[PDB]
Design a protein around this ligand. Sequence first.
Ligand SMILES: C[C@@H](O)[C@H](N)C(=O)O
Ligand SMILES: C[C@@H](O)[C@H](N)C(=O)O
Ligand SMILES: C[C@@H](O)[C@H](N)C(=O)O
Ligand SMILES: C[C@@H](O)[C@H](N)C(=O)O
Lengths: 160, 152, 380, 386
Amino acid sequence: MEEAVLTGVATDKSEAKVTVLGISDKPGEAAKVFRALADAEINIDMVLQNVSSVEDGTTDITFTCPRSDGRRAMEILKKLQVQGNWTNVLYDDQVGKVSLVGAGMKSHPGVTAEFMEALRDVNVNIELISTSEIRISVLIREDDLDAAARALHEQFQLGG
Amino acid sequence: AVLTGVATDKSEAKVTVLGISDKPGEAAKVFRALADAEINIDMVLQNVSSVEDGTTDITFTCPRSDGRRAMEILKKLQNWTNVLYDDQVGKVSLVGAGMKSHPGVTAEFMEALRDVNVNIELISTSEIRISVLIREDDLDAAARALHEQFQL
Amino acid sequence: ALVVQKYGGSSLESAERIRNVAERIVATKKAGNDVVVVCSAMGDTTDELLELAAAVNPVPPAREMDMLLTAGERISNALVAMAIESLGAEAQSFTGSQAGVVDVTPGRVREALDEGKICIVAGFGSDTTAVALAAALNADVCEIYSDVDGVYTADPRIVPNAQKLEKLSFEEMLELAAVGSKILVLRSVEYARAFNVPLRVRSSYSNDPGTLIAGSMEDIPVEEAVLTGVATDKSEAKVTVLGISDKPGEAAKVFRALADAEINIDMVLQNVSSVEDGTTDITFTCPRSDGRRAMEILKKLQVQGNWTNVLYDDQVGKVSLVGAGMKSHPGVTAEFMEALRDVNVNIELISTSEIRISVLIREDDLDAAARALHEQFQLG
Amino acid sequence: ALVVQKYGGSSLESAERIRNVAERIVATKKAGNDVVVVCSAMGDTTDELLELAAAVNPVPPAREMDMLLTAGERISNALVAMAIESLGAEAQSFTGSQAGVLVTPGRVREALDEGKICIVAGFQGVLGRGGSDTTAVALAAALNADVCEIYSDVDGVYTADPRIVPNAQKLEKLSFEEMLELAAVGSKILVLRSVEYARAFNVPLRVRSSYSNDPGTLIAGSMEDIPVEEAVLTGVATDKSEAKVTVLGISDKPGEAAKVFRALADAEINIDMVLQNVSSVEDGTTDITFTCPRSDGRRAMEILKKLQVGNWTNVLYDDQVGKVSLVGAGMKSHPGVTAEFMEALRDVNVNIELISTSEIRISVLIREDDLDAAARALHEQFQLGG
Ligand SMILES: C[C@@H](O)[C@H](N)C(=O)O
Ligand SMILES: C[C@@H](O)[C@H](N)C(=O)O
Ligand SMILES: C[C@@H](O)[C@H](N)C(=O)O
Ligand SMILES: C[C@@H](O)[C@H](N)C(=O)O
């Protein structure tokens, strides 16, 4: 009922993140961005869009992709900015990704708390968060992977 | 069912008032007679009346010393067909509890005694005992069979 | 001191009720006693489980049956335990097998009680193991809790003037329940008698002390002894076999056929034979549900030269007077018969022990007869 | 073969269904299989027993909770064994522990070699954890079972909720990861903890119905071992049980996530999904959005608003949100899947408020009113029906 089975911790430094800033929150605007990447055969992995501000009615969309296709990705988008569609497109090729894999995390909320507390206590800044019932992933600086994994290993006592 | 033991007796005498009318107040007459004579009562046994006749018999036991006196007490009060005296009667009982739900006890009691050829004259049982009146001499041969049957 | 406490399904029917029972258990601990508790399954769980067992398999294996019934009783054990520990106590559960017994040997239970724990004993019936532990541990008293708040001089709804007994002897209790209503398991009261463990019938819905069942009549002064109460029973049929030869083995034939067919006999009765004919009659009582099947068997043997006829009566009522005070006193048996005569009730059949008088009559007269007997003697 | 079979409470609702399931168990052995059966409590007994426990004691202690739930499952065990033995099978019963909970199924392998159908139910030694479902899979891993079947009133895993999408179909097979993901965001089809053991120890699961002879859906093989050319999109999951709370304007410093989710965990708030994008360079702040059951929403909001006065500029509340997701190994190494998803919803005019993903899943948060429309759009976009 209450306990969650945790199976291990994963790190990865294989990708870069691109962030479209100020995408207008209306039907069809996400399609514009991801169709462009699809036409250029850019295989993206994780995408994350949070809620739009009430003041503007705009949001940001961040996605990851293979580090090689990184600069290319931002450039396809940056070249199709012309309109009012978005204000900027950023590019980060030094981003890492640590994750806690398992199952049944929804009803064990202390796990999520302990995940943030682990990274906090090794002074690591959580830059993006994308979790679910079987997955907690955060993006941080690639240089903090070492210290993030050891914190998460120690905290949840994971290995083997 | 649980069975605690097997008690015998040779201290008593049975008295049977024959042919008593199965109408109200006739039993009172018999036992108010013994109550006046202050013969302390123990067993009483009355079965259902005859359809043909309309009468039963009332067999009761008492301290053997008071037995002949008691028989001749009820003789004076006489409607009834006869009164019989007995002082070679012996009582053997199986004491316990919960024998209603286990009827084999009742059977095996009666099976154990037939296998020793013992005269079962009267019977007066309940959930907590199975008492039967047999012939005084057969008490020990009756006991042994009960001890072996129910393992006491 | 050491107190054993049994709680039946009624007492543990619900959570709120279980928590109430739990406070009473802790209260008994707090009063300065080692407390052992025996729980039946909640409500009617055992019956519902028995129904379920029969439906899945008509002849259930004993092993799986042990598992089934043990599970049911272990639900209330758990809940009682939970309840007890929320009140401050330290609970210690036992299945009964690893409690004492098999024949009783409670090493573990005594060990737990010495640690100041409240032992909860479930299931491998409930009453018999409670008294068996009571005897094994040398308990000061074994308390049976239910909806009934004690033994009465008569059925309160039948006899308005009925009263709750403060105390009675073991064998007085045995006799009252042997003919009247089963308030305690007859079987469990015989262990009490055998091992001299006082029993207390009382209610789990009040602080009333109830009725004590303690001591033998044989160690009560002969002058002090009294009449105990009146018991009624309108659940029995009456079967009579006419024309059975007064020779060894014939009684055996009757009750073997009744035993084989699972007919619950009760209060068997036979009087002397008739020198003319050399034949006697054997009447017995059984539950009315068995009466028909009991008759079917005896009639089949009846129509085979064994005996004349087999009569049947499912409107018979049984009324009785109990009390150690009648064993040595004369005229009580006389006052009994006179009481029924004066209310125009006829005595069809009579049967006794040394401290019980029982008579079969029309069930329509049961109430009048019990009411007549109750005020005839001091009772009430 | 060696077959583990786990029957839920729905399958053991009554004496007739028990005997019925007993015949299925015997039919399975007759087909030349060693059988292990795991038993949930009859019908809703475990839920009803949990209530009772809570009623007699909030925070019931572990040992007695173990005794209680075991007892309930041990009833089913008694009845099923009883039925099994009625039909000619010889039964041996175990508590899920007597067969090692840890691993260590020595006692069970003895019984199987002697031709006995082994029944496992309850626990006693040291629960957690998933109950009968994970006991079944854990026994399947240790004994090296060819399959662990999970019987209920559910006859398989579908490409979508057939009540919503009429052209929805039943999957024959899918990978552990594809099931995990589908189960994670919408479904609620089986215990995920048990499916993570099956993934971890490579034990094939089969979800089928104890009311038909339909073979159900198979969960087997990793999507990591699926050839890239053969990978497919699996299904569409929906969920309108969630509310979303967004903390606006949290500064981007170490520990600030801790301050949010410590409060929620101490208040026992269940977190389905958490989402945080990059912070603004000027002012240095970002927002954290998380979803939780609608029954926890009111209270989650109460907590974080107390913490709003500093720490953040606002806390928002939304209990009319729905979640639609696509799952499939086929999207791992195929561009334009995300594109088709976003275009799919666009063409049915559904607005995408928030997005999250995994290697093989895309999820968006939408108005609950748009759920059915979005699901049908996605289902026919990627042509999952027939
Ligand atoms: C912001 C973006 O997701 C937009 N709401 C869309 O539907 O395309
Ligand atoms: C006792 C019996 O013989 C009679 N019918 C009576 O009531 O007195
Ligand atoms: C019936 C009884 O009188 C007989 N002596 C018997 O036991 O067989
Ligand atoms: C949670 C996030 O906003 C912050 N940077 C932290 O790691 O605490």
